[PDB]
Every structure is written in C-alpha cells, then in structure tokens.
Amino acid sequence: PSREGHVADLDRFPQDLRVYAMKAGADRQLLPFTEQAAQDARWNRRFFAPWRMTRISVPVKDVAAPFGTDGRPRGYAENLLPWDVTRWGALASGAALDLYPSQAWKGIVVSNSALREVPTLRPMFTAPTRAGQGYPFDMFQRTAVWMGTPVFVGHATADRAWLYVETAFAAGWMPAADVARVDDAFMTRYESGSLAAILRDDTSLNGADGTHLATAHIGTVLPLSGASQVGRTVLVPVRAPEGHAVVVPVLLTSGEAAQKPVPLTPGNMAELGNRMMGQPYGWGGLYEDRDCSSTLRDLFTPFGLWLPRNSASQAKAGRYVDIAKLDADDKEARIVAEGVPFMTLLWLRGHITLYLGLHEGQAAMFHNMWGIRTHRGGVEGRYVLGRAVVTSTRPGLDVPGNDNADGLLGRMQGMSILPG
C-alpha cells in the first residue's frame, strides 16, 4: 500500500462498529434476558473460582518447564543477546521449585499486572533478527491480569518478591506487591451485591481524598456499592502495608461503569468495541495492550459472556461450524450463510476474530492482529497492522509477498457461534 500500517481494507471497511451494528439492528437483544442472566451468573462463578480452591492446580513439571531444557537459557534478553547463563540460573534457584507448592492462600490483584512464564519482568525473544520473533514478542508474557482479579497463591520465590498464582483463566508468576491477601470476611463481602463492569479503557480509580489507587480497563469488574443518575460507586481493592486487602469506595460516571451485565445488543457492543478501535497490539497483553483473544474476552465481559484466555479455547466456545476443508470462496460463503453477526468468532491457528456481518458484499470482522506473513527478496517479513481493526477475511490481499495465497480466510478452520 501507500503508508505504514495501512491496507486497502481500512478504507473499504469503516473502522467504526456502529455501522455494522445499524445493519444488525442496533437495539436488538442478541440473547433473551433470562439466558443472558444465566451467562452472567456463570461468568461470576468462573471469575471467583480461585477463592474456592484449596491448593494450586498446576503440576510442578509445568512450572519447571519454562526454566529450560536441563535449565539452560532460552533465547534473547533486553540487550538482544542470549540470556546470561548466571542470571538465568539465579532465576531458577530463587524459584525454590524443590518446595513447590509452598503456599496455599487467597488474594486479589490490586493493580494491573501480568502472569509471567518465569519470575522476571525482563523479556525473552526467540530470535531478534527474525520477523515475528523479536521485539515486541516477549515470550515470558503469558497474559496481562486486570486489577480486581481473584487469585489463588501456590508458591513464592525464596526472596518473597514473586508469587506463583492462579487466576480463573491462567496461572504464572506475578510480582508479590500486586497481590493483597484476602480473608473470609473480605471475600464474602466482596462477592455480595451487584458487580459493575468498567466501560472505558484507562479509567483512573481515585479515592474521595484524591489518592490515586489504580487504573481500570474494559474487562474489569468491581463490586458496585451505589448508583445515582450519573454516578456509580465501586469498591476498589487496595493492598495495605501489612499485605492484606482493604476496599476503598471510588466514584465513577455512568459513562465509565455500569451494573453488570450490560444488555447484549449490537449497539452496546459497538460502543465498547469502538473504544478499543486502533489500540496497539500487545502479545499477551504486554504494555496493558491487547492481543486477538484478550480483545474478545474483554469485549464480552461487560455482557457477562465468559470467554477463556487463548484463541484455540475461545474457538471451542458456543456452537462450532467446521469449515476447514472448504475452498476459500466456499468458506466465505458459509460464513455469510451461517454466521451470526456480532456473535460469531472466526478461528484460524494463532488468530481469532469477531464476525460483524456483511458489508458491501464481504464478510467483515473486528480483530486485533499483528502482521501479514510475507517473503520478499528471499527474506521473511511481516506487514504490520499491529492494532484493533475492521477488515475483510483477506486483509492482506494487496500486500506484496503475502505467504497465504488465499489470506487469513484460507487458514480458517471454524466458526464459533456464541453463546454456549
């Protein structure tokens, strides 16, 4: 194309979910109230499940695996050189895996954080000089975790600076200072009453005294303790100096928070999704950005439809339609014939998208992606879009060197019609 990060689809398809929602019926209920209520109840059971565990579920073999084959260093660090043998060894020794699991207690994430493959915020890149394998693909980033997320704590490093914890959707190493310990009193009170869904990214949570507590993004849920015509008060978990959780009430606007679940309509979905439009891609939520699957999970959270964290798992949600063996144009035709706008996920290995309906005769999809795989002059590349966009099923059609003769469409295996 002409300029960086552009393809013709971004002019053909409006980067505005409202256009597709108008066509779908902006105020149409995509699920009946009772069924959406059931879905929301399930969402809450999944979210708080770590608080009912009595031990961590991850076997030590899986905890040990990322420390390397015979513990040897993996890949490249932040200096674009192979990970230092001594510093790598020190990560493993401090992990104290001979004692795993050494902890069994319940907590809550008090600030946006991450689950890491090993207990460091320093990165690992498999191959800095190869397209798709250098920065920003920090392979130690398993997933971002939003503030307010219940965790079960199963292990700590010897120095106590890192914990190995389990959320409803993933497990990994997390900085200890991002977790507050919760007791029965706290948990009971926290789960009683209604919850609110955060409706805008980068929503600052400040106490009535002006103290800044944390920032919340779409996908975040907090207890709702009051609501007026334009205001909503939420309870924000905060870590006290002694390590336990307290709650601080925070006043937000009705533009920033609503009682969960928000009604599931294309118009309501478009309003939330448009807030993500153009957001940079972050592998496993690096930089508090989003990737293909965290985009979809966070988009559906305010409506109470639970999705797992990874793309391949999300594809197994709802009602599957296999399309793997079809010719590319037959695949697009089947998506068009059977896909349910705003409620269907389109899946290929390593990528997942939301189907929005037909736009000017082509299937349209919302997704946050990295790049189109290319080869030019005999060298592998990526044509990077790197952000949340609306495209066709073949966004890379115009890109020179596109490795997929039939694009992403050609690689698609199935559609997943929500909910299950």
Q: What is the closest distance, in whole angstroms, from the C-beta atom of residue 64 to a copy of itself in the complex?
A: 21
Of the residues 266, 304, 396, 419, which one makes contact with Cl ion according to CB under 5 A = 396
CA distances from 339 to 173, 182, 408 (A): 38, 44, 17
Secondary structure (DSSP) of 94-109: HH-GGG-S---EEEEE
Stretch of 52-60, 196-204, 337-345, 375-383 lying at the interface with Cl ion (CB under 5 A): 375-383
CB of 46 to a copy of itself, least distance (A): 28
CB of 218 to a copy of itself, least distance (A): 15
What are the percentages of helix, strand and coil residues in the chain, rounded to 5? 30, 30, 40
Rounded Cα–Cα distance for residues 104 and 332 (Å): 49
Q: Does 407 bind Cl ion (CB under 5 A)?
A: yes
Site for Cl ion in 297-326 (CB under 5 A): 308
Q: Which residues contact 265 (CB under 8 A, 6 or more apart)?
A: 21, 25, 26, 27, 28, 29, 30
Considering only residues 213 to 252 of the shown chain, the ones binding a copy of itself according to CB under 8 A are: 213-215, 238-243, 246, 248
DSSP H helices in 13-105: 17-24, 33-47, 60-64, 85-95
Distances (CA, A) of 21 to 222, 273, 352, 379, 416: 28, 11, 20, 41, 19
10 Å CB burial of residue 86 (0-12, 13-18, 19+) is exposed
Among 408, 412, 415, 418, binds Cl ion (CB under 5 A): 408
Per CB under 5 A, 27 contacts Cl ion = yes
**Binding positions for a copy of itself, 319-378, rule CB under 8 A:** 370
177 contact choice in a copy of itself, Cl ion, none (CB below 5 to 8 Å, kind-dependent) = a copy of itself
In one-letter notation, the amino acid at residue 316 is K
288-327 positions binding a copy of itself, by CB under 8 A? 289
Question: Is the CB of 82 or the CB of 226 nearer to Cl ion?
Answer: 82
CB of 85 to a copy of itself, least distance (A): 10
Q: Which two tokens stand for residue 394?
A: 């073949």
Token pair listed for 323: 């399309």
Per rule CB under 8 A, is residue 154 in the interface with a copy of itself? no
What are the structure tokens assigned to 164, written together? 């190995």
List interacting residues with a copy of itself (CB under 8 A).
Answer: 4-5, 77-82, 84, 86-87, 111, 121-123, 134-136, 159-161, 176-177, 202, 204, 206-207, 209-215, 238-243, 246, 248, 278, 280-282, 286-287, 289, 370, 384, 386-387
List interacting residues with Cl ion (CB under 5 A).
Answer: 25-28, 131-132, 169, 308, 359-360, 372-373, 382, 394, 396, 407-408
